[PDB]
Symmetry: D2
Subunit: 331 residues, 4 copies
């Protein structure tokens, strides 16, 4: 008899179906930063990685496995076949196309559509009850594409949206005020990028509205120039790409924060992109980031934030530009 059998007596062997599996699609810097964050928060009893480049996929999987002694996620698997993703609670997408020189906004989205047209049906094939977390940019439009292709209900298709932008907001706010970002509250909503909206009314510390104590806040007369905080938020990623070539660590922690709320059914309020037909005068099928309650079933509730008219108009305007592209795609 073999050493294993001499040492161990087996009671029963037939086993499986992981109870808390997460898949990351795409193992670029963003995907791997999500992977390492998820692993170190103990969110999953199985992590699956899939990407098109087979060697790097196997490489990144082997590197993670070599660190199992220091982890509590007993099964890490990889492959380009999406069969490795079967029975995932959460599937995080982070894959797609980078912008070519002088390319239209449209048609870039379309190349990305053509990618999701392979990724998304394979995901649904193997985890039909999963929740989908779209991180690939342009995240608002691509979350729509994944919803259209998957046929999932609107609550189980989530985009990372302004979740990291709001994190950055609060970091920069805490730097001005000398307070930890956990105690600086403030929301960046809407379309992810140049045209996000900073909701100055809700910017507080300990419930003290900063707009009340400083009514010029977020305007032009603002001698303290508080609108620069929101400018710094939308320039953040480019500032970091300029310096290290790409962002990864911050997006990876906010995705894990979002994974936490989903996998542990916390019902925490996050600014993520969800379908907001029926709200703020939006009548098209578009996703924008509003504060959502995330949990075991994705987005089960929305917070109806009171916007000004200038805020309300800026949202309807991004809604229109997104549908303008989205109506011009084809699937």
């Amino acid at each position: 008899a073999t050493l294993k059998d001499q040492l161990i007596y087996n009671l029963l062997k037939e086993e499986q179906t992981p109870q808390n599996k997460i898949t990351v699609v795409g193992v670029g810097a963003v995907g791997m930063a999500c992977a390492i964050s998820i692993l170190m928060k103990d969110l999953a009893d199985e992590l699956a990685l899939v990407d098109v480049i087979e060697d790097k996929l196997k490489g990144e999987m082997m590197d993670l496995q070599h660190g199992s002694l220091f982890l509590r996620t007993p099964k890490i698997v990889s492959g380009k076949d999406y069969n490795v993703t079967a029975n995932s609670k959460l599937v995080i997408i982070t894959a797609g196309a980078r912008q070519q020189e002088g390319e239209s906004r449209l048609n870039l989205v379309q190349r990305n559509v053509n990618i999701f047209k392979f990724i998304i049906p394979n995901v649904v094939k193997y985890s039909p009850n999963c929740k989908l977390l779209i991180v690939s940019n342009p995240v608002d439009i691509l979350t729509y594409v994944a919803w259209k292709i998957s046929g999932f209900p609107k609550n189980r298709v989530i985009g990372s949206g302004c979740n990291l932008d709001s994190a950055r907001f609060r970091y920069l706010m805490g730097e001005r005020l000398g307070v930890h970002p956990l105690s600086c509250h403030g929301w960046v909503l809407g379309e992810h990028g140049d045209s996000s909206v900073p909701v100055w009314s809700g910017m507080n510390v300990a419930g003290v509205s900063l707009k009340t104590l400083h009514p010029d806040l977020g305007t032009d007369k603002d001698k303290e120039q508080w609108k620069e905080v929101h400018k710094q938020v939308v320039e953040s990623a480019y500032e970091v790409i300029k310096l290290k070539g790409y962002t990864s660590w911050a997006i990876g922690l906010s995705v894990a924060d979002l994974a936490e709320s989903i996998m542990k059914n916390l019902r925490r309020v996050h600014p993520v992109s969800t379908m907001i037909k029926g709200l703020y005068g939006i009548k098209d099928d578009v996703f924008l980031s509003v504060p959502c309650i995330l949990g075991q079933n994705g987005i089960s509730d929305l917070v109806k934030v009171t916007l000004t008219s200038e805020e309300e108009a800026r949202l309807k305007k991004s809604a229109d530009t997104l549908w303008g592209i989205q109506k011009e795609l084809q699937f």
Copy 2:
């Protein structure tokens, strides 16, 4: 409409089924210690508590709920009705009967058999697929009892066994050598109590056998009297009960550790009590403590420790004594 409806648009309605639910039965000091450690290790999306004294149970649940801001377990429930325990992956049994002056050990067990005849079927009714972790004393016999009455397979009924005794042993080993318990290694096996067996052959640091270095180890010729380390293990709860009147914190911590291995499917080895007919000449249906691989199916494998003649004899003697009593029970 309400303030809720005004602030919150709702997408879904409350289909749930918890996916990582734990129940502790018995809210004495042991149970509450298990509860608070499970809560602080983030092992469950729902904790249910059950006992017969309604007052204490509602207050303990309310006390925990007031801490929810600092926890990652968003639903804590309690009730004397076991319907609150529906859909538990793990049920931890701490309730029982305390031995009276001059009550024989048989009859003590039988009072517990009569209590378990109420708890175990109610647990099975609402969680037919759970793992059962029996913490109530005398643990080896009461694990037999919860097995018998539930009709679960052997892999899904576990007793605390010598888990905490082994932890205690490594603590004492650590203090003697000036190393942390995590890097001190030794196993206490068999019947939990005065007759447990210390496997002197397994005691080591960094794979350096202490018995080989110091052959006298564990005998009476031992100048360093290492046999009193096992004397301390089996007298610890007694000395701690002299001082504060009960033990709680170290049993809670050791139980939470087993729960982590089960809930996360780690396949770590722990000395817990499992039915060991077939090993070491034992031919009756007796539970003793032996190193068991723990995962999402409970005990999937066990380690066949090489024991000396003397060591094997004490296991045979405990199995006889245990069957001696189990033979006279009445289900």
Copy 3:
């Protein structure tokens, strides 16, 4: 040639002094709840416990010690004698006298003063640079006493205040809303107890104020009853005491949350009692709960909440009550 020395080669022997030491004064249910919560959050490399009953004290230290294997705090000590508290970064005081029948508020406070004339000087003797977290009740008066007897600067003397009161408020707020407490924001300030102040202006989810959305909120015209959420907060401990005899877990969790901000220099904002002479017209040396910024030097900063004139009145009445009793205390 012992076993240890045959096994282990020593490089140097001297050179300890704990780097992140915490003391808990008092080992009643509250203090032990703090101890286990602090131990499970890994905030300390040394934990010291002191009380007058040597029995329970030694037995609580031994119970915590037995679980070392499951912990990351390598030294746990205890003693009647304060020299075991030497070199604490943080000393948490839970000890006190409890009101007997017939006894008046003053006299009970005087008894507490007399106990603090032994405890406080002995903390200072051995950890002169520590921060003092004062949990004993009435917490506002006794934070003053600790401040007066120690001569510590006011940043280094802190009362747990309405920390757990705000945490309760957010639990109940989250129940009414279907949202996790981490996402329901709201502050209870002032005197800890019946006279506490629920600052309705700051109540919000995602920065949407509930008062602005539903202006009857808090007042008596309020159809939805929100004023009762606060008096539920005020009767919480009473409802739990009536049921289980005392409260332990929730206060232990909130105190550990304060410790984490202090030990880790987070500069998170907490509603704790500090000396507020010079704000809101309060002119006497009196401690009430405001949002304080908390870190390695204690209360470094303090938020100035905008209060309505009735709210201002309440803090004035409370501060007047408190000086009424403190000017009668005998140090």
Copy 4:
């Protein structure tokens, strides 16, 4: 008066010297893996990054700072100037020279001495009491270089050595036995690289020696060929480099596990590289991996493993080769 002063009243302004600071030198993949794991395990209240490429340096620090909201390390600083390093408890060196096509061993080491002639004296300038953890390869020689240049006592210069080799060994062991690596015990010792020594005699589960059960274990007669497990350990990095370009995640988790033992003073045992002249019959100033007790003083103690005559001779010959390189280095 600013918004900040309207919102916050300052009590105390000068505040500093950090109390749990860790520096990582080098912000390539290894160093950044260490940084994210350290941040992810709440080991430091300040983290400093140092490297010579200022752009990448600032970019990685900014990326991590943008996730502040998800972390518990309030201060992340960076600079090419080592003054940002001041008052570190622990300094992790990952920087070095990349090998060149057709460059000998003594040559590549010499260019690494040229680099350490700048790094080490600067570290020692600003943290003269720190612990030095060398991760740069060849780790055993470069740990010797760092010790010669620094003038530190041997307890405070630690090479990462075989720590990850043992972790990989225990993963491969667990993959064969169906047991988690935590419950699998191995020890790879000596010189990091092709010539390390797997101590077959220590390999066990639950104290059951594998070589005693299966005595051909590790040898050429082994019908199960367990020597192939060391072979996979020794060429695991070659395999990952060929697939993904470099190795990062697993070395980051293993360096963090070393950091947790030093910063929390655990006195866990780790196979790290230490100065061994005087032991295993070695006569020269060379560093070899050996099991060391790690705590706040660095290596306070080390374990004397009993080694066969073959194993001792493999260490002596590794030691002869290392001294042969080292005795020709130019400082």
